[model samples]
Target: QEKAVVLDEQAIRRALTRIAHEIIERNKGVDNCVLVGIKTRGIYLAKRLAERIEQIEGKPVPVGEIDITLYRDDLTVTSNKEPLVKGTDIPVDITDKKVILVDDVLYTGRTVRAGMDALMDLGRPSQIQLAVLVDRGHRELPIRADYVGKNVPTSKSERIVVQLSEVDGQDRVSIYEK
Candidate 1:
């Protein structure tokens, strides 16, 4: 399998740092703002964002992780089977708070929609914003990210894989061609 390396460790670090600064600037600080990571890799990205934000703002921001598997649109294969909700942890109440959804990559936008649905099920938020590391083209939904670390143009057959040290033993973004 051959893949083109898009973002290495240093690149990802600087990108996240830039995104942290952008988040602070756009929102005028992290006051009343909560960072919610979408699940799996998203959760790790959220953690990294939180750390960066804290390092920049000198204040801690609440970080949350959510598993939107149950809220997926194409999850009817099991029919009446109950989906096992594995992970979802939002410590702060989202009401009247700015919710920033963090994810590694933004593809079809379906995962984000499900994430928002999960948040809605928890509580009503003042607003919801999206932050993604990589935003490839071909969006099936009318969704966009407010803060994007990098924008990589890709084809339908190509896959953008985000590898994090927390899970993948390395921090890198690669484009795997099919």
Candidate 2:
């Protein structure tokens, strides 16, 4: 028997809708705002959110992409030599834009930290906020997402998997019991 099934697409839609509202509420609209997705999974969510933001605000905000794998502490801690680079789609200047960094899962918090470093290297933003699909506990760094879809508790040994339709051919979230 199947132990787990893919996350319901309806749930994901509702989650995005709720998150869209939260982003609008916190940022007070998409004006003077930009969404920077942290590569891979983040890019998908960022695009979805940008669409919703445009729908809600009746205007489109700039969307950007960043990959923080090279900037991660784990990249240094581990002997991972290969670097996988992705496109950065930020168009407007970040001098005074409210940047909302999007990511799939927030586990150790290092990814967000690394993402911040990566964003800073690109340009100076007025502010940087985090948005994540799932926020699991066990944060090594002091990083928190401003907008989160779900706070799923997990053991240190487990892994949180976020599957998006754009890349993964399906949309779902799963936790592997390691």
Candidate 3:
């Protein structure tokens, strides 16, 4: 037999929808904000984020997706040409805009760091915020997520698996342990 799932479809949907509201409320409206997603998982979340924000705000907003093949967290890339070389689909100019990065899981925070580093290569953005579906502990960096759907504390041995309907067959979150 299998244990009960951590978050079902309804739970995940509700949380994301609620998070959308919090994002708007915290920023005092979606003005000067752009949702930038860190692929390969963050793209879907960013898409949905824009949808919900539009639903509530009654207008569309910019959503950017960058292909960050950057896995090495410690290394820093300061050059300004690589982000466009990889692929950045930012609909609007991010200059002076508040950038919010969307992702599924927040663990070591290396991904967030890498994403921020990539953003710097692009035009300057005024502020940066992180939004994640689940936030597991053990952050290698000092950065913290601004918006979180669920904060699940787990040991290093365990893994947090997030399945989205856009990619996976269904939407479910599980804590997989040995």
Candidate 4:
């Protein structure tokens, strides 16, 4: 098996900090924008980004958690067991608001596609942008990220693993060959 560490703790921190700044600058401030994490690591990244944004903007940015298990297009390929529908929680209404979807990695683009479907069920937002910690090429759908921490070109058999302290007990991005 082949493995490599693409991003260490400090690199992850710097990437996230830069992402926060880019988010603020792109949206002209997060006053009418909300950060919606795409479950798992995305939620933690969203929270971390919100904290950084708050520190710079002197105000808290709304952060929401969304689970896309049910909305997934590849449900048939999943387990036979019942899918756990973790509810989506956005404190305020998203109507006319800018929504930035945060994710740990971007690969096939299917996850973001499902997330868009789930988000539409909640409410219509003025705009929707994607922010990903790592963008490993091999997109099946026509989806792209607006803010990317790193772009790691990988083969189909290679996998990107994002470890966050909030859930993984550490901060690092690694690649492993299967």
Instruction: Give candidate 4's root-mean-square deviation (CA, Å).
Output: 3.4
Global lDDT of each model?
Answer: 0.86, 0.77, 0.82, 0.86
Using Cα atoms with residue i matched to residue i, what is each candidate's TM-score against the true structure?
A: 0.89, 0.86, 0.87, 0.90
The TM-score measured for candidate 2 stands at 0.86
Cα error, residue 119 of model 4, in Å, equals: 1.0
TM-score of candidate 1 on Cα atoms, chains taken together = 0.89
RMSD of each: 4.0, 3.5, 5.2, 3.4
Question: Compared with the true structure, what per-residue lDDT tens digits does model 4 show for residues 1-178?
Answer: 4779999999999999999999989888888999999977898999999999999999898999887663334646431222344679988899899999998888888778777877898999999999999999888789999999998989887778888887878999999987
Clashing residue pairs for model 4: none
Q: Put down candidate 1 lDDT per residue, 38-142, tens digits, no spaces.
A: 878888888999999998888999999987553334644321222334667999899999999997888788778778878898899999999999998688779
Candidate 2 per-residue lDDT, tens place, 1-178, comes to: 2224334677777777788889999887778888888867888888899899889888987788886564434634432223334445578788778899998877777667767777787788899998888788788778888888888887776766777788878888877765
Model 3 clashes, total count: 0
lDDT of 3 by residue, 1-78 (tens): 243467788988888898899999999999889999888578888989899999999978788987765433345532
Model 2 Cα displacement at 83 (Å)?
9.7
Query: Which pairs clash in the backbone of model 2?
Result: none
Model 4 regions more than 4 Å off: 70-86
Arrange candidates, best lDDT first. Answer: 4, 1, 3, 2
